[PDB]
A paper describes a structure:
Nek2 (NIMA-related kinase 2) is a human cell cycle-dependent serine/threonine protein kinase that localizes to the centrosome. However, Nek2 does play a key role in ensuring timely assembly of the mitotic spindle, a scaffold that is vital for accurate segregation of sister chromatids during mitosis. Phosphorylation of these proteins by Nek2 in late G2 promotes linker disassembly and loss of centrosome cohesion; this in turn allows the timely separation of centrosomes in prophase.
Numbering used by the authors: 3 to 160, 177 to 279
Write the structure that this text describes.
Amino acid sequence: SRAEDYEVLYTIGTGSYGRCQKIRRKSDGKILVWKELDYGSMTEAEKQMLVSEVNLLRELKHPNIVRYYDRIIDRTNTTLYIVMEYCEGGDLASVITKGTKERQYLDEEFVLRVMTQLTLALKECHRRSDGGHTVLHRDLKPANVFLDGKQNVKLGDFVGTPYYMSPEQMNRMSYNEKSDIWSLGCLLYELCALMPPFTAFSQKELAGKIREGKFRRIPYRYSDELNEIITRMLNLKDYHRPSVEEILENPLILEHHHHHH
Ligand SMILES: NS(=O)(=O)c1ccc(Nc2nc(OCC3CCCCC3)c3nc[nH]c3n2)cc1
């Protein structure tokens, strides 16, 4: 309930909401992280915006969703502390970087686990169980996808260039569930090719490439089937993209893909 109940270990990275640090829970020694939100400049109706969102996401529970643990207010530091599961295996962006450095494509099996488990995660957001929510992730990219010790997927974190900008957002249309699917298509594509499906140096020529909807096949190392389903998420028409259910129906997706390395 208070900062005193936790001991900061060190500081990881600083993302959107603010700083993110690894921590030990005083009472039993569990390693975790939390995320700072300085609320010190917010109003009392800018705040009301945050608190409903924070509660919505707090109810989200899934083995491939980063687990919520605690919230903490600190008037002194005017900071809101959201405490969450620590993800030992880092993020997929590092995995992609590593593939690039080593010049080694990832196994189709590893891509199939990631696709399967992010799809289960998004399904719990989009549908799910019972349940009220309907949540869209709205920021699906490798830096927001973490791995545990057995490299299982944890979906987290609900001037640069927006490679994964969907065709809806780019044509003034509201972000919908199929926009999550486009983002997943970009991520899986980049996971295979070790580069995103549309590259460019200016945003206006990236927008142009995205509008035409054309890109390289993922490497030949990968099956026609995997290329097909990823390509399907990159349909320009959102109603031509698979839903999370259609994805999971794919013959490629098997039981062993749902858990551990
Ligand atoms: N770079 S790295 O490869 O060395 C490595 C990376 C991340 C982690 N672990 C980890 N990180 C998080 O966010 C850190 C990250 C989140 C997005 C914004 C910037 C900061 C988490 N949020 C919940 N659980 C989290 N777990 C371990 C090693």
